[PDB]
Design a protein around this nucleic acid. Structure first.
Lengths: 79, 49, 63
RNA sequence: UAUAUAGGCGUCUGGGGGGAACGCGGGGAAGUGAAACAUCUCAGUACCCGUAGGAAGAGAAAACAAAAUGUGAUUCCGUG
RNA sequence: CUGCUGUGAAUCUGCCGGGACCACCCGGUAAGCCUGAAUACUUCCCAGUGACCGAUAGCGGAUUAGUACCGUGAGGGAAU
RNA sequence: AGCGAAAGCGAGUCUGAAUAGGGCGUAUCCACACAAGAGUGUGUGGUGUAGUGGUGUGUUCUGGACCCGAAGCGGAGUGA
RNA sequence: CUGUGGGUAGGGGUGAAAGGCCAAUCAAACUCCGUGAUAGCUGGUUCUCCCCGAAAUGCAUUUAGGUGCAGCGUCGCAUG
RNA sequence: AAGUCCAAGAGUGCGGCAGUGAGACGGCGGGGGAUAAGCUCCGUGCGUCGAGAGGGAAACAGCCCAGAUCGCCGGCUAAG
RNA sequence: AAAACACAGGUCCGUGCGAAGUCGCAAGACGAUGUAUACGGACUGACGCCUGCCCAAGGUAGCGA
RNA sequence: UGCACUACGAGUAAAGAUGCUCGUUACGCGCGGCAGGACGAAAAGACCCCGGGACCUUCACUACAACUUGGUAUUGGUGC
RNA sequence: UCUGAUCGUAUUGGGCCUCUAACCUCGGACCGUAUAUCCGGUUCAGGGACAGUGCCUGGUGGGUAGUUUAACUGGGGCGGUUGCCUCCUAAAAUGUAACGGAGGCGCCCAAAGGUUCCCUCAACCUGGACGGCAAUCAGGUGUUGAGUGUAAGUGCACAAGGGAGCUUGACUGCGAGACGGACAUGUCGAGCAGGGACGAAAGUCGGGACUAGUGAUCCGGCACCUCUGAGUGGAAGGGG
């Protein structure tokens, strides 16, 4: 009475790695995603696998534009 | 193999510089592409094997 | 008696000028085609051993 | 059988067996370790055979070494 | 450096070694012998020693001890 | 005195076409500059870095290795 | 059928064949030796007080009742 | 931002030493089952036992109250 | 303790004779002081019963009890 | 053979209670009998699983004995 | 010796027939010998350069020996799995078991890659020879329901979908800083230089819209290198 099922895949730890208002260094990953759940705005770039990474030191921000959630890096002012 | 690993070597310095899979059915001949040869420090036409 | 030193580790790990233990990365010997040059460059070099196995490697090297 | 020898006869001198370890030569395991196992290790140990000596074995370069104007049989210790 | 089986050289412009091999250099001079001292061990004997045991210990054996006794035998083996 | 596979060089070396970035090392600290605030760095100065040999303790290594315990393996001998 | 005297000895014997018998044991006898065999297995592990105080999870495993690393304890050190 | 801050006897890092890696049950959310099992497999800064006495539940590790430094022939009280 | 082993009987195979075979590293030993009417191995296990037209090439030829 | 001035019912409990709870019954001590309990004694379950072993089979692996095939030494002469 | 048939003589192997002196005979007769079925010796008779034995070598070989013959598992076997990718389970961060529910992978593409530029489908309605429900064409409606090489999901109409021009970045030397993490693995990466592609430039290009298409170490093969080279120069081997 064998079972045809039983297989699965590994833990691709997707999800947002830096949330709103979080201070980031350049190059850091912001979301690991499959597809285009999020888009890039200002100072945000897309990697090979639809990853989103910072392009300047700053603070993360999540907004929307034209109907698609986008991630931006607002430049923190030096106090 | 249908898609064996073929090695491409520059024509000038004859250094085996690259390797990649090519099809023997779609292209049953030795392809010729221009790649970068580090020895010559310049682009040189590269040919299979 | 004398404490023998493990060969398989004395010939796989090194000791820097301060004490770090370094090692060469794996997955770079054969089947190097289809491994993008980025991956190969990543696998080249000598990285410090993880602190987890640092003690094990130290025991193996010192005897 | 002919030379001759084997062999036979006599007489003289020696060996024979034992002994705890150690010496030299020669045969030579497996349990075990490898987390299994065969190479391998155990280990040339155990055991055995031959054979002595108060000790034995090795010993007087068909040697090492590396351009040093080199050391100068062997043995056994300590490093390496 | 060596054991067995084949084959198989020259005597100094000879021959071997210098870690495949080749040339130059360098060191020796095979296929003949003997050789003590430095060194390993205690059957036995003599004189001592012990931050060793002290009769369920220390030898199996302080007393019949390889005894009684067990086994056909090799062999095992006490107590006082 | 470290870097490098090594030749090799050396407060630096490896990589590489490149003081272009890195890797490892230049013990540490504090002051001054010159920089951008990509996380801080680059040069000046000042203090001068500390290992090693006894022995205690804990783990660990090679030996049986905290103690007891098999069935079974091998060598030599004893038994109709 | 039986007496006396003999022969066949262990990976060997003997077997009108049962894996039967070979000194109260035989799908390889006995004794001594290698030997304090090995056992991821079971048992055992001896006086006291104080302080701290777990886990039964993840990954990998010729792996699942073992083990390595991480997690969770304690102790020293550094920051706070 | 405050907050306990003569402490949670906290956190992080690195070192010596570990044990653990057979969990049970109760409340929730679920899979397997027959939406049975004192069943099985999961999540739960959920609890207790594990490793926890005391009081209640007749008796009754896992339920309710409550965390045992010792003495007192005092009071107050929890669950009941 | 038997239906099992054995057994006299049968059929194959090896052996031409310091045989074949077996013990033994070898010498050697048994077989055998024997010689294919014998020796060794192998199965079976007294005794009786088991069926015709084709069957220098006659044909489906499997009996068909 | 852990103990002892060792009842029964219904329960509870590692789920079959002389030993716990609540009730019932029972003067102390013996003798002869039965065999329903003490999960009675006996034998670290022979069944089943796990680990180790042994012996056996074979077109499992790897070796070897033995057999057999060729080169060469023993090993020679004359003729084609 | 260069381009080169045949030559004369001397050195040799094999096949075949023989011979005797090697060697062999448990065939005979004599001697040691008084006894001896031993043994050795002499001689005769047969074989005979075979056979046997030594070293080397290819086959047959449970005759014998040493061993192996996995784990999960609602006991074990039988059956069925064992790695990677996607979804649900999975309790709206990550993650999370079961012999729970579904499926795919062990590739393919020299263009289905890079870049520049342009376009918008499916379906439906109306009309048209074959031609129809569905082919090609015309008009309209048509914001995603078509498609996206390959599983499912996340996305894609700003197009990542559809066409075309040119090209090989399916680069070399690196890499701040991060994700995931027992460890070993695994992913992302702006930007710097060299030399290229496309484009007027700005710019994009370190393979494919993303996620599977893979296997540590050891050992060895093949090309190049300012490495090393067992006295020295080389070479052998080693090293990158």
């Amino acid at each position: 009475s064998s079972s045809r099922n039983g297989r699965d895949s590994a833990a691709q730890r997707l999800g947002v790695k830096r949330f709103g208002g979080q201070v980031v260094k350049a190059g850091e990953i912001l979301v690991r995603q499959r597809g285009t759940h999020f888009h890039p705005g200002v100072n945000v770039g897309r990697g090979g696998d639809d990853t989103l990474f910072a392009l300047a030191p700053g603070a993360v921000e999540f907004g929307a534009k034209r109907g698609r959630k986008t991630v931006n890096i607002v430049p923190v002012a030096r106090p | 193999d249908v898609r064996p690993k073929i090695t491409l070597a520059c024509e000038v310095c004859k250094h085996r510089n690259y390797i990649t899979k090519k099809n023997r059915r779609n292209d049953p001949d030795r392809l010729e592409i221009k790649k970068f040869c580090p020895n010559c420090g310049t682009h040189q036409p590269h040919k299979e094997s | 008696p004398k404490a023998k030193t493990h060969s398989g580790a004395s010939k796989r790990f090194r000791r820097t000028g301060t004490g770090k233990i370094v090692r060469q990365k794996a997955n770079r010997r054969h089947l190097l085609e289809h491994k993008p040059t980025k991956r190969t460059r990543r696998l080249d070099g000598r990285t410090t051993v993880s602190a987890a196995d640092n003690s094990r490697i130290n025991k193996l090297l010192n005897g």
